[PDB]
Ligand SMILES: O=C(O)CNC(=O)C(=O)O
Ligand SMILES: [Mg+2]
Ligand code: NI
């Protein structure tokens with residue numbers, strides 16, 4: 001078995017190997033990459049996502065989210081308070097302000113220490129989940145707006161044609177902006193490109209050990225667990241590396257820098273934080289190997305998780321027994 005310790009693997013494809021996206025994902029899996037839940041892909045030196053980022057300031061962040069924490073430094077939840085619209089140029093200026101900017105630090109490890117010590121005492125503002133793309137249309141390789149769609153994959157594998165679409169999302173971050181512990185909708189893959197700016201630190205639990213994280217989460221967030229049998233679908237709970245190590249939960253960490261891709265694998269729980277002003281693009285995708293994960297994915301039916309239009313068909317076809325209850329939670 002390849003990668004039996006479930007380490008995060010880093011790949012350096014050549015420009016030739018960068019042509020065929022599906023083939024490269026299958027290659028990484030042949031080497032055991034998926035066992036970690038997360039892999040890094042450093043693009044060939046010849047590749048670029050677009051020519052420059054000089055003209056992005058007029059993108060609108062219609063609903064910036066202030067991430068307000070509750071709990072203790074290593075075990076907390078966050079809620080999202082909606083803020084007034086602002087442009088990316090306005091948000092960048094805010095991120096760089098004395099109130100929100102990255103503090104002085106020695107290295108990534110020092111900054112990680114400061115994040116876990118101090119995150120709860122601040123409320124950073126995240127421009128998340130913005131439909132759109134920063135890839136130039138002429139970028140042919142690993143262009144996250146030109147991927148094969150999940151609907152087409154389900155149709156190829158299973159023969160059933162379904163409604164729905166699959167488009168990317170932009171994320172504008174600042175120091176301390178946080179993504180809570182989650183797997184993807186329907187335990188899909190994700191791919192995330194850091195277009196510009198400061199790094200993003202990731203934590204990940206191997207898929208084979210995801211239920212260990214779920215059991216800890218039920219212990220640590222006991223009211224939330226009574227409220228919903230899949231409350232990590234709400235995407236609000238944080239648990240620090242120190243707490244994970246105290247509780248024997250297997251995990252790994254890595255920092256993504258500008259110009260790098262990350263892939264999350266089916267049922268790979270992940271969480272993390274941004275170092276400073278940045279912009280990422282991410283989208284979900286599927287492969288043949290996903291289908292069995294999609295069939296077994298948990299679902300929130302309490303009403304909190306509320307997701308896209310396109311998830312309806314996935315539930316309906318892959319999980320017909322759950323459909324009725326899950327759809328009630330959507331309506
Ligand atoms: O970058 C973020 O805030 C969150 N991204 C992801 O969870 C992802 O790409 O799967
Ligand atoms: Mg612009
Ligand atoms: Ni994710």
Ligand SMILES: [Zn+2]
Nearest residue numbers: 228300302304
């Ligand atoms: Zn729920």
